[PDB]
Amino acid sequence: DLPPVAKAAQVVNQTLQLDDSYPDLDSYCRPGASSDYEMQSSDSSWAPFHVVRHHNIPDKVFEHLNAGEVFTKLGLFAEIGYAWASIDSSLFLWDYTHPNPELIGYEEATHTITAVALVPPKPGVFVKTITHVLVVATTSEIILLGVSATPTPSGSKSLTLYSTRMSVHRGGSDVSFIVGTKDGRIFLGGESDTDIHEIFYQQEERWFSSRCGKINHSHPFGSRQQEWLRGLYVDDTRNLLYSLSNRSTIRTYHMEGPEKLTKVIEKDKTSCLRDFAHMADSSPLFTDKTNIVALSPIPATEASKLHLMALTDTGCRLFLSATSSASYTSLAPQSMQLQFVKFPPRESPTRIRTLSQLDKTSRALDPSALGFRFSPGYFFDVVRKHPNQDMLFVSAPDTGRIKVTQPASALKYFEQGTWIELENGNRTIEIGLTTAPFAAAKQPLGFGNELAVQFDQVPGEFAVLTNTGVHIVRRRRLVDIFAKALGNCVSASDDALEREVRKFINQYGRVETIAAALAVACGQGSDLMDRNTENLARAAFIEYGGQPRLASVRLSSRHDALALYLTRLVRTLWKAKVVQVDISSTIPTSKLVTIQENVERLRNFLEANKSTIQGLAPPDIANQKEHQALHALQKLMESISEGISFVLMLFDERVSDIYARLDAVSQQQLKDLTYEQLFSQTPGKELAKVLVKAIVNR
């Protein structure tokens, strides 16, 4: 009744939903606490992160820095691969990915530079080629410069600066923190007070208004005690702005309009401590003596309730929710509460490899000087136990264990962690993301599924700026770990592989492990011996793939692995519309090519092992449906490749011309045609037969 490709498409749809059901952050960080870690040596194949390269500071910057009379400062523009150094009233930018960079000097400023930042531009203000705005704050004024960071053949942005005539006198309040919103709004704060200012600017000059203005959103008056800021933090997904003070007070501001900023929550350390005392597990790691050293916003795409992470100097990660009083009039929250605490790990870093209650007393992250969190939870902590050498603790969610955990009430914040040592003299200054922000889905459920996006977006990379250079740290995927582990099994027994494979099964489950073997066998991870590793991966896919059984049948883990891998290769395509009407393609052509290559390499792998892989060759009811299921998947693969080739052929011509000379029903059918329908449904095949028949006649 139902043909092969339609049967296989059913498996894809159900697999997509399974990946998009990956637990949301609120679900495994429920009210309570956790100390769950599996620590890995930094030199281990199971390390969750590792250093890939380093970039020294140019010698000319050292000449200027040691020529500093009063004040110097370093910072990162990780979004574009640039770093900067300010010396008194002079500023120098450079591309740290370049082996011998030239210094972009800017010395117009008259007074000491106190802060520098790279923010998005205000729309409809600048020429489209202006990609960013450079904000330069001195003790006398703030200066805006246009920036064009266009990519080069080498892979590092070319940076050119534009004057703007946009500037405003600073005033009496120091500026040490500058942050920008998605829409180009510029907010300022510093070490004089807790006030937050905003810089406005517009293209047109008016007789009653200048091109650039500044206002204090805090409207202070009367008696005020000493207190200033340690940082500013933006969350565009909620239109919120957070400030952290030197007294560890957390203030939340809501952008109720394009020019408004309203303080809506103020939560001091006492309030946090009161929440903490009402929790089941209190700890001497968080007291009135403890300082909060950093905040990190959590976007609404990642979690509904948990808005914010706060890091203590003892290494505790405080996760705070925020809630509005009502459900309708963005809606501003009015309350903030400490809900969940992740306590520090216990293992300390060691030169030599060392050998179930809540651990709420570890000092391993004491003192924590700097801290950063990146979605879906990558955590960097600069531990400064000694005044000369920083130690870097880096951890990630145990995505494999979180995905397999059952039932939902057993979910905990499992983590994989490691210690990265920086050499003597390296003082960490800043850590920034160099790749695109992580997102496996558009809502909390499914958002954190690292496994699903292993082959759709490169692994996250992070630039660690120190006083001596920039270190690149890269997140490692399951396939990276699996390939590395197998690389160590090349010179060992039949039982050596089985032992290493069992480690993966116990953490990730059998299907995910066999899917990783299939991926490695198909060359995934090789963008980083390699024939033997891929042959070992093939051996693991065959030997440990399981078999089909009567419970309606339960197909082998080998089959589910093939369906899982294939689904993840096309997840960006399946439910997407083929075209966007001047008609164009929803998916960029370059992305369609790589997807097709991946599908074809998978097909090539199955053909070259049609005789050795169980189920491919024809074979009692169990092995029968195993053969039918595997056959249907392979028919979907060739249909996927044909479908992609058809779309590429289509846009090589002039589709808008073809679309014009077309009937309405066929325009409408093409309007809402998805890749799924093209791959696995008759109306999609019949429509493709129309479009080709129109191209051939002209």
Binding site: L103, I104, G105, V125, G146, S163, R165, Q203
Partner: peptide
Amino acid sequence: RKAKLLPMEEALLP
């Protein structure tokens, strides 16, 4: 080398 600052005329439209 002091960075060449191209003019405002190019920068902002229209």
